[PDB]
CSV table of C-alpha atoms in Angstrom, one decimal:
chain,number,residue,atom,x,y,z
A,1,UNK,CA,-8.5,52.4,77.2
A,2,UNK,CA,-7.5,54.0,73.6
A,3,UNK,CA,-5.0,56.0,73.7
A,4,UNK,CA,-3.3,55.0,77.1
A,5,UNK,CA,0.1,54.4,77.4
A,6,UNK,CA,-0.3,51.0,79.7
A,7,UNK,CA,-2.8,50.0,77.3
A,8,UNK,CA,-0.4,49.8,74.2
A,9,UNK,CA,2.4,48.2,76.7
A,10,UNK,CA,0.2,45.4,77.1
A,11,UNK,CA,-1.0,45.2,73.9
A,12,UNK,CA,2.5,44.8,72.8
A,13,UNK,CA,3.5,42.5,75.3
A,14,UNK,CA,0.5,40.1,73.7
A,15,UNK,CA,2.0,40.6,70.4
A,16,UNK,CA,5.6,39.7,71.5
A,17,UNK,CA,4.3,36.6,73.3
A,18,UNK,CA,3.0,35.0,70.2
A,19,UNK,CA,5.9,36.3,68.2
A,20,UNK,CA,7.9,34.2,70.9
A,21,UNK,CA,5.7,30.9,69.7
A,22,UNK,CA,5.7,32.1,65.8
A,23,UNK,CA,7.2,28.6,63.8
A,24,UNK,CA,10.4,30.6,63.5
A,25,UNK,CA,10.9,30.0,67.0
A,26,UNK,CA,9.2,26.8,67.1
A,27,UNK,CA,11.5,24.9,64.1
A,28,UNK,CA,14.1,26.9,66.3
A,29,UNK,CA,13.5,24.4,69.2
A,30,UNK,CA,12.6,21.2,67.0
A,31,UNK,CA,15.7,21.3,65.9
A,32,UNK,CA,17.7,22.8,68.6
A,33,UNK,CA,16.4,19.8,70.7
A,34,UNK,CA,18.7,17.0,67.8
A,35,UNK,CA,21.1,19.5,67.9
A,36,UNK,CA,21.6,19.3,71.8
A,37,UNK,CA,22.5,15.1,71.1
A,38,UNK,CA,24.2,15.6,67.4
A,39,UNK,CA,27.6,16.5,67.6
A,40,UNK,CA,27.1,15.9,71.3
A,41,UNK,CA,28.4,12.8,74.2
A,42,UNK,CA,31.8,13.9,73.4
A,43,UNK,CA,31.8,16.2,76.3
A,44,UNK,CA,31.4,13.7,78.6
A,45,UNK,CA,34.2,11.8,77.5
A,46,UNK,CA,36.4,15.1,77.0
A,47,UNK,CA,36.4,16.2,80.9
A,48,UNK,CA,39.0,13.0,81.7
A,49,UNK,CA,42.5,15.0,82.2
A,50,UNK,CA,44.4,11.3,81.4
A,51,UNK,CA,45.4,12.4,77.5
A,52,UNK,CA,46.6,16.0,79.0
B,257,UNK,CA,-1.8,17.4,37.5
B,258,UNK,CA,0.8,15.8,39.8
B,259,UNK,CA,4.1,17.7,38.3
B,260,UNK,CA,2.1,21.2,38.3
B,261,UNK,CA,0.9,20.3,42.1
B,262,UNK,CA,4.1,19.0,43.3
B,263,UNK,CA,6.4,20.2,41.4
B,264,UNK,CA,9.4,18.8,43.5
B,265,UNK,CA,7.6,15.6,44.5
B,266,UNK,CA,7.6,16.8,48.4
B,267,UNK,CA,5.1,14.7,49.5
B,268,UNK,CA,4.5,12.7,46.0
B,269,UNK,CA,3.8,9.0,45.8
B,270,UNK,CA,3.8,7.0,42.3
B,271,UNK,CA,1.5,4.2,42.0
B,272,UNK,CA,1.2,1.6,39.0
B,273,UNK,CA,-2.0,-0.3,39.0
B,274,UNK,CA,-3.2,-3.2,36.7
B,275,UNK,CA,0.2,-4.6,37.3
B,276,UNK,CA,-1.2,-8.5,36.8
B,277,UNK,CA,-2.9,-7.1,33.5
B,278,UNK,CA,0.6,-5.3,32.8
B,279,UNK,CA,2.1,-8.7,32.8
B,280,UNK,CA,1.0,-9.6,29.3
B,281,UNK,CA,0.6,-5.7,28.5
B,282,UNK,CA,3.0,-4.3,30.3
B,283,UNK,CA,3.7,-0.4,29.5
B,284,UNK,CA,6.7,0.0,27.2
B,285,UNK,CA,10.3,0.7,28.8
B,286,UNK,CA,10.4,4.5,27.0
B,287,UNK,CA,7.7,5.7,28.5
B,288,UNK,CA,6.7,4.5,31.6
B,289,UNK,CA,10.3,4.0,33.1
B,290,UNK,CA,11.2,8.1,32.1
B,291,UNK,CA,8.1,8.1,34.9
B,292,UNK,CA,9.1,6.1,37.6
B,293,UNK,CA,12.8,8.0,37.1
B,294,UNK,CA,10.9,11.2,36.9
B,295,UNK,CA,12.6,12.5,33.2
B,296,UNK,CA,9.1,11.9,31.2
B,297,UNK,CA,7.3,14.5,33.8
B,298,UNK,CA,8.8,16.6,36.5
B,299,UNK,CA,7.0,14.7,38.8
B,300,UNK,CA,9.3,13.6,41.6
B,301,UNK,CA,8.3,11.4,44.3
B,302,UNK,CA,9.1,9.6,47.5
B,303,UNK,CA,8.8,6.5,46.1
B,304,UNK,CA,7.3,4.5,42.9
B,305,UNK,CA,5.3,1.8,43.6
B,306,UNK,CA,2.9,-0.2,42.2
B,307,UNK,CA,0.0,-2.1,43.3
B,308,UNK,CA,-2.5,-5.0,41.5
B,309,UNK,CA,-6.5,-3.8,40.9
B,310,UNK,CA,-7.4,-6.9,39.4
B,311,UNK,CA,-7.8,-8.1,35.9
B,312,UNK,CA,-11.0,-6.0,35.4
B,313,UNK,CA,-13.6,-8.0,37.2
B,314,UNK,CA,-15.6,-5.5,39.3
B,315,UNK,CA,-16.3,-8.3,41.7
B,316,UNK,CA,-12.9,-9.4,43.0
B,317,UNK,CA,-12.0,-9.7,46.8
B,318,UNK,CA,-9.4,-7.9,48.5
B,319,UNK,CA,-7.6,-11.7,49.5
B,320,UNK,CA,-7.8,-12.5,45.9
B,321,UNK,CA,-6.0,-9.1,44.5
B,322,UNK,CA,-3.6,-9.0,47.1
B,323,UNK,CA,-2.6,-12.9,45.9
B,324,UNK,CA,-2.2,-11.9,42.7
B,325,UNK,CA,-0.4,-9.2,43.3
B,326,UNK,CA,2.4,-11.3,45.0
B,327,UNK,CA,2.9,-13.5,41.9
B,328,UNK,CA,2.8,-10.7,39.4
B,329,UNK,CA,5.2,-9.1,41.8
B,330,UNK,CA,7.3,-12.2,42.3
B,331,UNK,CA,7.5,-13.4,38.2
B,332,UNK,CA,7.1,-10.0,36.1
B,333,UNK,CA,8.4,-7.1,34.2
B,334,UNK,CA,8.1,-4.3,36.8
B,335,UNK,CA,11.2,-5.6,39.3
B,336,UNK,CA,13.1,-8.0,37.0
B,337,UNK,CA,14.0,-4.9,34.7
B,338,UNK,CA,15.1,-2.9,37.9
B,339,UNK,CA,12.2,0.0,37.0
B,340,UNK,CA,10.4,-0.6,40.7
B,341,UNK,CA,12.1,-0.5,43.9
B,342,UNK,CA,11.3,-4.0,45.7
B,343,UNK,CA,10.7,-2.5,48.9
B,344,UNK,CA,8.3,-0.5,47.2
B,345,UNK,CA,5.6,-2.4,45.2
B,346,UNK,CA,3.0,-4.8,47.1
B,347,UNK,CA,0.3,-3.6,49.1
B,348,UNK,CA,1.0,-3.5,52.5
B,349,UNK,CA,5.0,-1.4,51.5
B,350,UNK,CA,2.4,1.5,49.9
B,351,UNK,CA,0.5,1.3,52.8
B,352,UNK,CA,3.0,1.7,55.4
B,353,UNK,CA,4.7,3.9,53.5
B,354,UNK,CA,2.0,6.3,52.9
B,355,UNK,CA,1.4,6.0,57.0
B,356,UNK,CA,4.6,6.9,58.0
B,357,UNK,CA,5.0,9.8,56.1
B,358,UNK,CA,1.2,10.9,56.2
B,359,UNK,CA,1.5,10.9,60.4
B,360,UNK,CA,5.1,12.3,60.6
B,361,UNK,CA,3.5,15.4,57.9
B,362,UNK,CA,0.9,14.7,60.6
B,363,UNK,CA,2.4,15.8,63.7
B,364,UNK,CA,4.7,18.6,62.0
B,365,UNK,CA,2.1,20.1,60.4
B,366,UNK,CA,-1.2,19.9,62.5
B,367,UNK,CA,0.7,21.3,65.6
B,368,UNK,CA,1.6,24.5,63.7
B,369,UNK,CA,-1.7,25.2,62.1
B,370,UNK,CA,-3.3,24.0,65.2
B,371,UNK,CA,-1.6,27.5,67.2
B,372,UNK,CA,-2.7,29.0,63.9
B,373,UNK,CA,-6.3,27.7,64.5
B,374,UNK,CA,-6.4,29.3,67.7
B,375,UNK,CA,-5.0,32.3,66.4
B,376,UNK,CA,-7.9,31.7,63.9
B,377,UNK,CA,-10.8,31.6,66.2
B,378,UNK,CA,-9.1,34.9,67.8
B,379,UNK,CA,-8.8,36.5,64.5
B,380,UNK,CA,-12.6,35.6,64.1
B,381,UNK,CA,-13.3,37.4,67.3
B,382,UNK,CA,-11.2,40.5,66.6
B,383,UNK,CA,-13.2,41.5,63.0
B,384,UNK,CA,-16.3,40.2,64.7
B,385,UNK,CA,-16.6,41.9,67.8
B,386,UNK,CA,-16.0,44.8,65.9
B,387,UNK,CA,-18.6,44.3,63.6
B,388,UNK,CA,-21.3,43.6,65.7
B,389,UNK,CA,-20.3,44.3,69.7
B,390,UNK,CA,-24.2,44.4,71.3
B,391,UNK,CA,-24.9,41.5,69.3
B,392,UNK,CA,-23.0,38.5,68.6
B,393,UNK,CA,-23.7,35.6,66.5
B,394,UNK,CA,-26.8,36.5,65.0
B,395,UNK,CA,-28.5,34.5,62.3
B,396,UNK,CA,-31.0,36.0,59.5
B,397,UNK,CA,-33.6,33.5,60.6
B,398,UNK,CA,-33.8,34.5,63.6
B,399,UNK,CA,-33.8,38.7,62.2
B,400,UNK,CA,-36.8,37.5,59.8
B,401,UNK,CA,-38.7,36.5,62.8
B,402,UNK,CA,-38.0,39.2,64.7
B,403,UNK,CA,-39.1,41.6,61.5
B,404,UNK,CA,-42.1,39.5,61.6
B,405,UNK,CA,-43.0,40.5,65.0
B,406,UNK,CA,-42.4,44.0,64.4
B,407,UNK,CA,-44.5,44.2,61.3
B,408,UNK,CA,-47.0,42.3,63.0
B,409,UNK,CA,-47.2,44.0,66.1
């Protein structure tokens, strides 16, 4: 397994993954999740064409 | 110790005990109130609160100090002079308030080093297999009695 190609992809593609769950990304989606409702249910209303 | 281990009061709660005793000995204005405004000490907090221990008997029931708290509470010094926040001395306000924020630190924090304790126990396995890949967990009990079979035998 050392020194194969495949080997270090997969390796990498383990170290990636828990990059991809690191806090960073974590607080990312805590707060993206407010986010999403703050600033937000204007859309909604927006859509009506009645004011244009 | 608090302003060197919190120096910004992030999860810092202030306390005043012997409140009832305080009542005829209450700390003077100059120094204690710099405290609960955080200008004597860095210390900053969440909240400053006091709570009654009693008037020194070792014997006293929780029913008893929580009573007195509410008169000491209700007549003295520590709210009438606006250096307590009302919502903040008593009891059962430290106690809630130490709840909330303890399980909300709780579930922000436990989560994260919870992932990390996984990542721990796999970190654990990476040095250790490593170290020792025919043998794993092996204790130095059980090598002495194995050493003592040898030199037996």
């Amino acid at each position: 397994a050392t020194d194969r190609g495949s080997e270090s992809d997969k390796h990498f593609r383990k170290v990636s993954d828990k990059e991809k769950i690191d806090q960073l990304q974590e607080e990312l989606l805590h707060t993206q999740l407010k986010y999403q409702r703050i600033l937000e249910r204007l859309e909604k209303e927006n859509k009506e064409l009645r004011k244009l | 110790l608090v302003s060197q281990m919190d120096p910004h009061g992030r999860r810092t709660i202030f306390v005043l005990t012997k409140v009832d005793l305080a009542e005829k000995n209450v700390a003077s204005p100059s120094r204690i109130q710099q405290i609960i405004e955080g200008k004597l000490f860095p210390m900053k907090a969440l909240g400053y609160f006091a709570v009654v221990t009693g008037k020194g008997n070792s014997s006293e029931s929780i029913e008893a100090i929580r009573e007195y708290e509410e008169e000491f509470f209700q007549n003295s010094k520590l709210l009438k002079t606006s250096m307590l926040k009302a919502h903040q001395v008593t009891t059962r306000n430290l106690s809630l308030a130490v709840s909330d924020c303890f399980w909300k630190m709780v579930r922000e924090s436990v989560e994260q080093q919870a992932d990390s304790f996984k990542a721990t126990r796999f970190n654990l396995e990476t040095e250790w297999k490593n170290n020792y890949p025919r043998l794993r967990e092996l204790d130095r009990n059980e090598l002495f009695e194995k050493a003592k079979n040898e030199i037996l035998d």
